[PDB]
Amino acid sequence: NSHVQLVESGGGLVQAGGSLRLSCAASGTISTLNAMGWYRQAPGKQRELLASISNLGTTYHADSVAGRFTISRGSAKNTVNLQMNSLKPDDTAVYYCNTRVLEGGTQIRDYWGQGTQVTVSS
Amino acid sequence: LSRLDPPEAEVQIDRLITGRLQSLQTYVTQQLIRAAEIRASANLAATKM
Amino acid sequence: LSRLDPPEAEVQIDRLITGRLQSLQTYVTQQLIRAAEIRASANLAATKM
């Protein structure tokens, strides 16, 4: 019954040059979060990966967010926080959170949360 | 008409109208073909008479 | 089916079904006309025989 679930929070309207921090909480029957990622599906734009952290601590950051978004995995290793520094207009999007789970050592299942909206205006 | 408002029900009414109109056209064409057949039959019957 | 999900693929399938059905119907009508012509020819042949 406790199926893997993700929850996104921390987004919202921010003045250009500001900063925020999205928090992604994972729950349910989480066996192993092999890969952990943050995505954004802006209104009228396809979902795009921004930052992600593997279970080994190695992290990837998209060029659209490289140098501004820093992804850090909590000590519990269940939640990932994306600190957004110097938020620019490109950050206006509905941010989604994803994780890959290896169920049974062979089934790669990708789980997604509700997501949170971010907006940057002039 | 009752379930949906006119602006949205217009598409459903158009689909239904197209279907019914096409069916009526099919029936008319079949009737014309059978009328031609029976016309030939009547001509040959008149020839026999 | 593969590229698009069912809810959006339904309209495409409807358009394709309409096109194929109309093509088949035109073929059937042409076959009926040719059948009538060949029926007249066969009646002529039977009369000749």
Add this chain to the structure above:
Amino acid sequence: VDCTMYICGDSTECSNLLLQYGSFCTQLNRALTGIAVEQDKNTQEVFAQVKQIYKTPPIKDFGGFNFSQILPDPSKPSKRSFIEDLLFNKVTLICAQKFNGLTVLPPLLTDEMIAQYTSALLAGTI
């Protein structure tokens, strides 16, 4: 032709969507079946005039008239006459078109039976 296979070949969602379009399928199938039966009716009416099969005389005298050309030739594998086989050769594909739900029902009267009827008519006339 089968409507459902042609429009919705091997698919199920297409079949379900077509199910609500009515009975066009039945109408088209009935029309095609009617045409198919009409073909047999036409050929039978044309060639079934003779009540009995009339054999040709064992010896051809006919007062000097030579009917070899139109009479059947037992020598050839097929018993069609000298002219009929010439027509078949002159007139001499759809076989591989069966993929899209098509079908070609065989004629009720085989060419051999039509040749038999024509030979009977020829013998009767002679």
Add this chain to the structure above:
Amino acid sequence: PLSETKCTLKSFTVEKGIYQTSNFRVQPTESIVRFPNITNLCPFGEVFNATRFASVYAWNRKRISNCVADYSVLYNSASFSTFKCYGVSPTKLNDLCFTNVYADSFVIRGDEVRQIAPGQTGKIADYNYKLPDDFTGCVIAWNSNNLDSKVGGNYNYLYRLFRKSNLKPFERDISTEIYQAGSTPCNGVEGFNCYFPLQSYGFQPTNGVGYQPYRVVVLSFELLHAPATVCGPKKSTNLVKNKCVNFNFNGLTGTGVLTESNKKFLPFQQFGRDIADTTDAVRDPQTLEILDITPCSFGGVSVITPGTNTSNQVAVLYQDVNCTEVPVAIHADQLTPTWRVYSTGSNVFQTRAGCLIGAEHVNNSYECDIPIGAGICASYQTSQSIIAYTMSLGAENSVAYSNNSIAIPTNFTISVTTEILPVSMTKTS
């Protein structure tokens, strides 16, 4: 079948004749997926068959991406003293896709192989190569005494014995500044309380298996929600022939019966198309042979029956199909005692029209009663049963022709015959 005909006619009474009822469609039995040959596997040999490996402190990192990884050569091969994986099943590697792969190759003493694992301690783990606690990947090691040892002491391989802090996971430290092991600063001068930061194993052929050099390669897989650049070989199904099956040749999807083909494709040609543009022949990507595509049944089903007022038995005609397909009509699902009796028996007969079941093929000829097709006709007579026979064109009769004989009638007869003709139709508006 009689009840199906009744439902089709929407009547409880069926007259003598033949009625089209349903369609006999052959469903696929299996699925076939064929993809190009083994092809360009990832460069495993480069890392494994490399003549010389780097030092443990200078462990060589090799990035692997954008290539198919055939991991079977790793475990299917018993040329590795140690083989283990973390976070994934080793047998599942050939069916996995990863964004990036990093192969860490170096040489260490066999007895020190234990230090190469998550949460391990010691000089090798702390100061030469440290692994993450939740490492996701595989570690491979094998003996290298015959390669990494020389008579008198092989001093090429070096390892870091001292350092201020333990190396972080996947961290390399190549700086060799004199480590301050004592209160007195070394100032980059080796001596008392200042030892050579690196050390040489001095591998010798006389060294024991534990002390002998061992070559180790560690494959770490990176997954960061990014597109996967590596993917195990697309396991292609075997080749099935002469049976209906769903086939997918490198994306070309279809359903039919694969048969040996006598065509001749040009080397660059892959598949052929009929005059109607429909796919007709395909060549297997894995190996170069051609196969032809054919439809399965596409057949129809008709019921031959005398008028229900006369009898109750029926016969089934499967249009333009082989007699082996007949009983493949979604059987094992119809009524047990009523439909499967018509499935197959000694009654089975074959004609150009199709397969006929429930009728005996007699030799006698009679005027057509129910036209089957292609010169065959069916009738109910005999003990009574259904018989399929060859149509009798008519009664045999010969005229006693002679060149001087004549036939003149002596009496007559008046015959009255009826002829019916339609004249009009209901005037519907």
